[PDB]
């Protein structure tokens, strides 16, 4: 009965996925191979064709994004034919460097071996493949407390970081057979990262305040056609407001607002006075003025919103429903000056898809 | 069945109402007498204590008001005794009198006679007791377009506004038996409005902007026990966001934040400057700095988010479930700024409550 949901969800997507790429006629045949596959081992393999276009599908199934108007010009990387733990990490360094591309950001994701009986062929323990590491040490505070957890699984396992306030994460990853898994520190060199300036304000700099240029998600599950890929990291480019407004802003993230009040030059004293809704806009403002600078790629929440809106036109003129999360599309900085605040979106889930998984520790 | 419906609300309103005000004894007793009554009448009569406190519970359960924590403390008029327009009128004019009291505002409602057999006995037209007036003609935009629709309504039958930006609509109410509405002018000196200036931008003025000090809802039926009173008008001060991030600044209301970006000195020509964020913090600022001045009360989102949370502790200290709903609770600007951006909430429908009903134009 596992083996009839795998065909079940076979057959929907190979049908949908053909009919999409204008080849309905080969629908039988396949089907009819894929259920032989299935019969004799338990499972069955994608052609490159369908992996790509899955990923890609998935990525225009995401309720929570606002960026899914580029979703058919995703770069999929097939790594289905790994099998070493040094292979694993040079196809994590590889996708940091190729996204990257010396800023130009190109929306990338590498695929890794799917779970066989649910069992993981390879276990990504970050949740993105950059990010920073976080401390707490009775009363002290360091570095990002949503990475506390993770931190110290890997202060656990060898590692042992500087205690900065933006120390890099290694890598950490465990394969099928193997009891602990093994990290190896990101070489700086594919690192970009961004200082934090602000246009018109000189005192910004004093927060040395920094942040990482590409956002690689490596906490999903890549769900094909029944097939669960569960190690296949995904990056896009930022929207300002995802840095400014709560990786920096946040009470439990970086908790800056009231540093910025004060550099701005302005008191933060009285609700009354909006102070941290002036901060926060300056605070964003500086964070695209500083990605806009360096020649690292992001866009602001309004131009994010306008190509969303070209997303539903879109699927209108297509002939496909429209799926949305509106509590995750609206921006965290003035909301209803978008289109998205003033509509309602069907939050059903639809696949393929990414879905959430928790991780070891935790 | 009508009846039956009628009976099962009954029930369930009186032991609840009972329970809370300490007299479970006497609910026998009474839903005796009320169905006795609706055996007899088709329905039954609230005694003031009920009255009162079927208010109080309808706005404690209000799922998208931030405003709840003072529910208790509703000041409430009880007219189910008036017959005439004029009757009606007055008491129009008193709560306006004293729900303004001066600039330090009463949270108050004024019940007027239930529907009997879904025939209402007094229908209000206006959407707002005090509200201004909004004309189209030929491509010329004047006042309120949210208003466009009563106010052709109102010129049909014999008004005429001045068409400035800011005209007061008159009273419009129809009695039960009557074909046509009847309307009165509102007089000024029960209108208090407030100038909007900005506490440190003097060329703020320039934009001769303006709003009512009390926002009077008369567009809802409150409901209790199964009775219906589809004009009961009640009113609170205002969160400040709500005059400048959507009555002043909406494209499809005042669409003002153009011109205030022009008056504070900053260019509207690039997403990326975040100009129109700008200019809805310091828009709002002005709002908050102004009903201060002026004496008139008003609260600011963040103090508003706080006193909801205070509302939410006091509920589970009291063992009533709590009911909300996150996309109105949230404020238009910085919502994760505040707790409610953070946490989820059941929306259930419980009543006593208030709910909105269309109007005979529209
Ligand atoms: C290309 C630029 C992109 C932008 C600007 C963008 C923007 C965002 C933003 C702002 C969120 C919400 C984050 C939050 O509010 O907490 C989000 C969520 C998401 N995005 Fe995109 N995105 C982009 C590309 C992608 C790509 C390439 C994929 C996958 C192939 C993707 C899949 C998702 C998913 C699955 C979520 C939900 C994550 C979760 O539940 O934790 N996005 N996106
Ligand atoms: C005392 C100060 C009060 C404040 C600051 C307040 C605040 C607000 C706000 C900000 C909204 C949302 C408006 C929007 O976003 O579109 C709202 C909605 C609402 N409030 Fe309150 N409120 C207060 C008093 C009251 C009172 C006295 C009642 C009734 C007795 C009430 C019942 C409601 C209802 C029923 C809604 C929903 C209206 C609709 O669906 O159109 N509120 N309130
Ligand atoms: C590809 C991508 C691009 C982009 N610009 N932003 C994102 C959002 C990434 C992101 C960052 N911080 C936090 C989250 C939420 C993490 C998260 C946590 C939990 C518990 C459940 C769940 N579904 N998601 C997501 C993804
Ligand atoms: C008592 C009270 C106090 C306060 N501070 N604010 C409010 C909000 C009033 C308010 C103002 N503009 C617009 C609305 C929404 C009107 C509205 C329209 C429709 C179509 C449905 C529906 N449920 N509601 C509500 C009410
Ligand atoms: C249904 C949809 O969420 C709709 O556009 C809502 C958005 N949330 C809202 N929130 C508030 N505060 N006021 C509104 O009038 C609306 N309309
Ligand atoms: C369930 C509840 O709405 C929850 O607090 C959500 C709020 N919406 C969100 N929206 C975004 N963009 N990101 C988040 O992490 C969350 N968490
Ligand atoms: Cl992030
Ligand atoms: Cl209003």
Redesign the interface.
């Known amino acids: 009965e596992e083996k009839e949901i795998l065909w079940n969800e076979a057959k929907a997507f190979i049908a949908a996925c053909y009919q999409e790429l204008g080849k309905a006629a080969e629908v039988k045949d396949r089907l009819a191979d894929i259920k032989s596959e299935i019969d004799l081992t338990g499972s069955y393999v994608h052609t490159k064709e369908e992996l790509e276009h899955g990923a890609k599908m998935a990525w225009r199934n995401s309720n929570r994004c606002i960026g899914r108007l580029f979703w058919n010009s995703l770069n999929v990387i097939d790594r289905r034919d790994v099998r070493t733990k040094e292979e694993v990490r040079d196809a994590l360094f590889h996708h940091i460097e190729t996204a990257t591309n010396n800023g130009k950001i190109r929306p990338t994701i590498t695929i890794f071996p799917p779970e066989e009986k649910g069992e993981k062929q390879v276990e990504i323990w970050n949740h993105q493949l950059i990010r920073y590491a976080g401390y707490e040490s009775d009363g002290e505070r360091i570095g990002d407390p949503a990475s506390c957890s993770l931190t110290a699984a890997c202060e656990e396992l060898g590692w042992r970081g500087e205690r900065t306030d933006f120390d890099l994460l290694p890598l950490i990853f465990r394969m099928k057979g193997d009891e602990q898994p093994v990290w190896y520190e990101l070489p700086r060199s594919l690192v970009i990262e961004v200082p934090i300036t602000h246009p018109d304000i000189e005192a910004f700099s004093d927060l040395e305040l920094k942040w990482y240029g590409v956002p690689i998600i490596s906490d999903m599950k890549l769900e094909v056609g029944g097939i669960h890929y569960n190690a296949a990291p995904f990056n896009g480019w930022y929207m300002g407001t995802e840095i400014g407004?709560?990786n920096l802003?946040?009470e439990k993230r970086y908790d800056k607002?009231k540093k910025v009040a004060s550099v701005i030059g302005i008191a933060a004293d009285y609700?009354?006075?909006?102070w941290?809704?002036?901060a926060?806009?300056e605070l964003?403002?500086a964070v695209?003025?500083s990605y806009?600078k360096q020649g690292v790629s992001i866009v602001?929440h309004?131009?994010a919103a306008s190509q969303f809106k070209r997303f539903e036109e879109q699927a209108e003129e297509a002939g496909r429903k429209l799926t949305g999360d509106?509590?995750w599309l609206?921006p965290?900085?003035?909301?209803?000056?978008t289109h998205i605040?003033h509509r309602s979106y069907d939050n059903s889930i639809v696949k393929p898809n990414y879905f959430y998984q928790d991780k070891p520790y935790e």
Chains 1, 2 share one sequence.
């Open positions: 407004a709560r802003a946040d607002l609700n009354t006075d909006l941290k809704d002036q926060l806009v964003n403002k695209l003025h806009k602001d309004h131009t509106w509590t609206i965290p900085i003035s909301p209803a000056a605040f």
